């Protein structure tokens, strides 16, 4: 796997692995049992002649011909702990989301859905929160939570609203959410965020279509006003 | 603009405008969606061993 | 024909399932494949064996093999045992009646564990399908199904009815609220899978795959939305192998709790929860030591928390056996001594006890006082042979030969031996020949009850197959060394002649007439030697793989051969020609029998199936599937009545011959829901249905749901047919939709179109009606529809111009 000549080879982690340095300047960590490159380290721009290891390869010192030392520190347990914690945190979010939606705590469910990137739960949270909002835009707590959203969360939310807007059976939920954004944010900041405008461009033509509709639904309704005036005769 | 496929590999976006992230779908929901897609694409000698 | 039916199953002390122990020192119920076995520790013998029915081979019996019972669950108070099987069905057998009273089937897969509640009214059953069913004994049905687990449930704990803890092969603890019917809190047991879960008051111990075992404190009333179950400390058990199953036992007199971890390894480690006072002094001792070390006070706390788990639990002792421990269970606790029964993987159960005082147990090592090996063999029986009188059945396994009388079904004597490949019953029946993997021949005597003489150098390699002549004077031995040896008996055994052969002798096997001898070889050709002339006659050819068994018909004119290629060839003697080649078993056919004085033959294979064929027919009379694991050997009686087959799981087994149309659906939907509205209003006016209660939704919402179910394309004509007298009801319904503004906003467009298709349809007839109340309904419905439609236009409008603004502003900025 080395592009150029290998100048140094040292065992690390007892029998399990081997580290090799080559004239290409790239240090490769292999698995002795399987003979495959587990990791590649590239901290130099010249051939490497000397490779010193301490504590069974926990410390690796490699010197460049140019004169650069790279002091590599083993941290595998460190990253493995980190990914374990991230997995630990993620389950607490999905479970807390399930408990909130069953309880009806939409304001807290909204925040979890956005972080977890959960569309239908997000859509369900807004939809049934709106129904309660029927029963300023949504409610004081959720109107505050949406306001605190950062630029990344804002970008994610409107993309969902664009997709929701295209469907005439779900445009109503999208429009009220967009109204709260315009009502609870500085539109100047909304403009400067990159990627806003292009997603923003797509939602007028559907929004205008909904306006041509509804108004026709609105216009027709005076048939009832024709009905009552006919009774009055 | 027209809704297309999900930009993320971990989500299913239909032409209806609805997006479905895999992690949150129930197993029964995942099964029917897989079958729905399937319909979509369909029309589109050693001595010791022998005794022992 | 005559159907071969399975008379008696024996030789299995126990099977792979949890043991059930009760004190009368107690009585143990062991699993015996599909069948259930009751044993008594005091006598160390089987009390009774419980077969559900459907005897193997019967017409009613299912062709598929019966499933081994996955789990055994019995409530001592109710005196009923319940067993789950592999297909997911549960069978509840009463201890006294010893027969099924109830049957439950709610699991799509095999069941892991079965849990009786304290009252005994209902059972929580968890299965590999990840669905846990709460079966009510009186209801005989599952109250609710628990599926949040993504994988098999290794265990679950339900001491309290209101809250349940479940661990699963997903590796996850799930807190289940049985009122909610859904899991409230979920957390990772380990990065690997958790197989063992047990709880003692607040502390909850979970065993991951690797040695580390985590302890979780649970405060059932924490109700902070989180932290209901929280980690105290993680303690490394000595055994690397995962802890399958864990229990606590506590002594009331001394208030001392001990817990063992059932490691997948044979060693079983038991630990003792130090007294809370003894925990405190140990903590006060450790801090004093840590001060002597000179560690910083913060570091002192770090050592204490790491040693905190060690403070609660003290290693008590560890129980080691010769072989792997399949199951274990606390039997009793006494101030003098603990007791424990554990069932090994190889089908013997030993009852260990530990006398203890204060901290360190008095017994240096564990002692088994009760153990059973007389009905069961640790080693699978490789070769079985039947006595000429048929009274005595010989079963030769590695390290042991066991002889059983068919009528008694109890072992008469047991012989120590080696890894016996083949067994043969001497002439006259006072004796038995075995051949071991070491190559030393064995001469056994029934009368003396022991091996007479072992000829170490009789043969070089192992004797894999072995024969005897009809007269029995001459003994033929088959082996891997590629050399046959002929041995003759005298009132001493002398080796008459040696036959060299090119390839290893898979099967020496002899004819009754003693005219010719068949040889099976790894080169896939079966040569035939005349036994009298000692010269080679004919060789079978075309076997894809070597012949596992060779067979000569009663008339001696046919040679039936079963091969590792899984096909049976039947060669005629006169010309050595195969009449038919038959792929009988999906796995290889190890041994093949005759019905004596008949062309029929029986076969056995690693698939565990036994098949009965007829020579003239060349078809299989009957299929037999009783053997859970692979049948290693098959034997035929001299009488031919009873055919012995033995499984790999030590089962010794013997077979003996005996419409509403859309639009209209809206109409009655109006009638039912509207009729309720007048009833409610009439009840309201006074103070100043059964299906719907099952529906448990409001009448208007039910009418609204029906409206969505009706197709829009066939909506128009559906509204067309609808009579005007119903329209008054429809207007009244729409009036009731408005009273809940939320209901309208959910489906405002569909509601509007429908009211519109009505008014246009009946406008000329509607103006006829002069009822003032209808006008007030028409007055009311108008106002809020206008408000609702105006609000949507207001909200819909507000987005377009405002969003037009930002696009224009960005355009000016970036132009």
Curated annotation (Swiss-Prot), chain A:
WD repeats lie at residues 1-42, 44-82, 92-133. It is found in: Nucleus, Nucleolus. It comes from the Eukaryota. Interacts with snoRNA U3. Interacts with MPP10. Component of the ribosomal small subunit (SSU) processome composed of at least 40 protein subunits and snoRNA U3. Present with 8070 molecules/cell in log phase SD medium. Involved in nucleolar processing of pre-18S ribosomal RNA. This is U3 small nucleolar RNA-associated protein 13. The chain holds residues 573 to 815 of 817 of the full protein.
Swiss-Prot record, chain B:
Involved in nucleolar processing of pre-18S ribosomal RNA. Required for the early cleavages at sites A0, A1 and A2 during 18S ribosomal pre-RNA processing. It is found in: Nucleus, Nucleolus. Coiled coil: none annotated. The lineage of its organism: Eukaryota, Fungi, Dikarya, Ascomycota, Saccharomycotina. Component of a heterotrimeric complex containing IMP3, IMP4 and MPP10. Interacts with snoRNA U3. Component of the ribosomal small subunit (SSU) processome composed of at least 40 protein subunits and snoRNA U3. Interacts with the SSU processome subunits EMG1, IMP3, IMP4, KRR1, NOC4/UTP19, NOP1, RPS4A, RPS4B, RPS6A, RPS6B, RPS7A, RPS7B, RPS9A, RPS9B, RPS14A, RPS14B, UTP1-UTP18, UTP20-UTP22 and UTP25. This is U3 small nucleolar RNA-associated protein MPP10. Belongs to the MPP10 family.
Curated annotation (Swiss-Prot), chain C:
GO terms for cellular component: 90S preribosome; nucleolus; nucleoplasm; Pwp2p-containing subcomplex of 90S preribosome; small-subunit processome. WD repeats lie at residues 64-94, 106-136, 148-177, 189-217, 376-405, 415-445, 458-488, 542-572, 584-614, 626-656. It holds the Pfam family Beta-prop_WDR3_1st. Gene3D superfamilies: YVTN repeat-like/Quinoprotein amine dehydrogenase (2.130.10.10). GO terms for molecular function: snoRNA binding; U3 snoRNA binding. Disulfide bonds: none annotated. It is found in: Nucleus, Nucleolus. Involved in nucleolar processing of pre-18S ribosomal RNA. This is U3 small nucleolar RNA-associated protein 12. It comes from Saccharomyces cerevisiae (strain ATCC 204508 / S288c).
